[PDB]
Structure 1
Amino acid sequence: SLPDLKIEKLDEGVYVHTSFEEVNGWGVVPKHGLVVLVNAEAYLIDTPFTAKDTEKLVTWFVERGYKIKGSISSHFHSDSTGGIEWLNSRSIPTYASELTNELLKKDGKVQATNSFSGVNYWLVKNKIEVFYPGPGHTPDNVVVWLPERKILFGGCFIKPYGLGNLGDANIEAWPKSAKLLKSKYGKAKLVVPSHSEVGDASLLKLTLEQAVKGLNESKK
């Protein structure tokens, strides 16, 4: 009895997909990803938690006729990578940074078929940019920017009311990383967090506040 996959339009050619999963002791957690349409080409930004929701998601666009050209995962946790296996079984290219691929293999999980590195990677020139702001939520977390719509996909890095799961976090790097991201993408119109709804650049500033706060708090 878990909630159904949501598919909602956010902007022209940009959809938010919402999937739900019970997570440890935190109850049912919503997780936001995007599907970015580049004409007839569809790109998943993070997979749903599960293979089933990934199939549902893909079949929903395949059914309306688009070509799934690829998937990019913003960090190694299964709320970003849960459907990589299923995609791979269907010949859909999957992408992750080399670091993200190293952590997947280290946890006994299937890896993306295509890796990248460098602070900046373009999945699609002048359309989908992949950016590494430095450790935060995880050592490997990256963000995805959509220049043509001014939409920034923040992932589990963006945490405007509390940092969430610190199990793999780097509290000491987060403020710096938060500040850089803040500077770089200060002018996004929309900011899409993994576990909060879409807001504006204010969430960049709140994330920075939480990391700073989170930091002192663990110092005492």
Structure 2
Amino acid sequence: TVIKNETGTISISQLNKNVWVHTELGSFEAVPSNGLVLNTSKGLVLVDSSWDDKLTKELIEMVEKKFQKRVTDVIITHAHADCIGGIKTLKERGIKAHSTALTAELAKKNGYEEPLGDLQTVTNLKFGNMKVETFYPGKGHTEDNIVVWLPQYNILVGGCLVKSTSAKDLGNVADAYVNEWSTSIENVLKRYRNINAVVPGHGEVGDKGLLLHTLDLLK
């Protein structure tokens, strides 16, 4: 079950009952970016926003209209435009933008409005009956990158720390820590022993093979 806007730049496909993956395309050459949309008994929760405030505002309206609920919280995985691009849209709509303190300060060094900076290395959030765990595995794609784990589904949102199956390029490594990236993916693997689905920053949902694939690219 996939829902798109009239343009094709935004789509939301269901992963399962209350877990959907939202994907937006940003021009530059159109690049897709993934994130999660969690349907809970107490509102919609998202993992990452979109490239900018226009797309982010449109993504929000799309999901709010569909589920007839308001987006209450959003988890920013790192301080790049594809995740925190619509930070200005979240704050004026009373949406809580959760992030580690580091992501918060890097958001300001990069010119984005500041997120909450509330997430610790390990933080467990529960929205209604939806359990979420955010984890900072260390430096990799960026200095502040975190992953999100849904224990009830064993679904991992590796985000930009994980590359999709056909990606042969690590992407932007100007702000990355290539050498540590590998140790950080290892911490994710050591922490979650029974991974089912793995959602990469860009690309189709895969499994733990995507983390092994990314470690291969890092070699």
Q: Which TM-score applies when normalising by structure 1? A: 0.88
Distance 2:121 2:161 in 1: 16
Deviates more, 1:151-160 or 1:57-66: 57-66
Q: Match for 1:6 among 11, 17, 26?
A: 11
Task: Provide Cα deviations, 1:29-88, integer angstroms capped at 9, x if missing partner.
Answer: 110111111224210100011212222222123223113111110000010001110111
Q: Name the aligned partner's letter for residue 138 of structure 1.
A: T
Distance 1:153 1:108 in 2: 25
Deviation at 1:117, TM superposition (A): 4.2
Deviates more, 1:122-131 or 1:185-194: 122-131
8 Å contact 1:15–1:34 — kept in the other structure?
yes
The answer as to 2:31 corresponding to 1:29 is yes
Q: Residue in 2 aligned with 1:140? A: 144
Spell out the pairing of 1:28-47 with structure 2 (5 A cutoff). 28-47=30-49
8 Å contact 1:71–1:93 — kept in the other structure?
yes
- Stretches of structure 1 lacking an aligned partner (at least 5 in a row): 214-220
- Stretches of structure 2 lacking an aligned partner (at least 5 in a row): 1-6
Q: Residue in 2 aligned with 1:77? A: 80
Distance 2:189 2:107 in 1: 28
Task: Provide Cα deviations, 1:79-128, integer angstroms capped at 9, x if missing partner.
Answer: 0001110111111111111100111111222111x222431012327701
Q: Residue in 1 aligned with 2:97? A: 94
RMSD value, Cα = 1.7
8 Å contact 1:182–1:205 — kept in the other structure?
no
User: Sequence identity of aligned pairs in percent?
Assistant: 37
Q: Residue in 2 aligned with 1:61? A: 63
Secondary structure of 1:164's match?
coil
The answer as to 2:166 corresponding to 1:187 is no
Distance 1:157 1:149 in 2: 20
The answer as to 2:114 corresponding to 1:111 is yes
Distance 2:172 2:63 in 1: 32
Distance 2:46 2:154 in 1: 17
Q: Which TM-score applies when normalising by structure 2? A: 0.89
Task: Provide Cα deviations, 1:184-215, integer angstroms capped at 9, x if missing partner.
Answer: 2242110000112100111111112222x2xx
8 Å contact 2:32–2:202 — kept in the other structure?
yes
Q: Residue in 2 aligned with 1:202? A: 209
Distance 1:4 1:108 in 2: 25
8 Å contact 1:105–1:111 — kept in the other structure?
yes
Q: Residue in 1 aligned with 2:3? A: none
8 Å contact 1:47–1:84 — kept in the other structure?
yes
8 Å contact 2:119–2:134 — kept in the other structure?
no
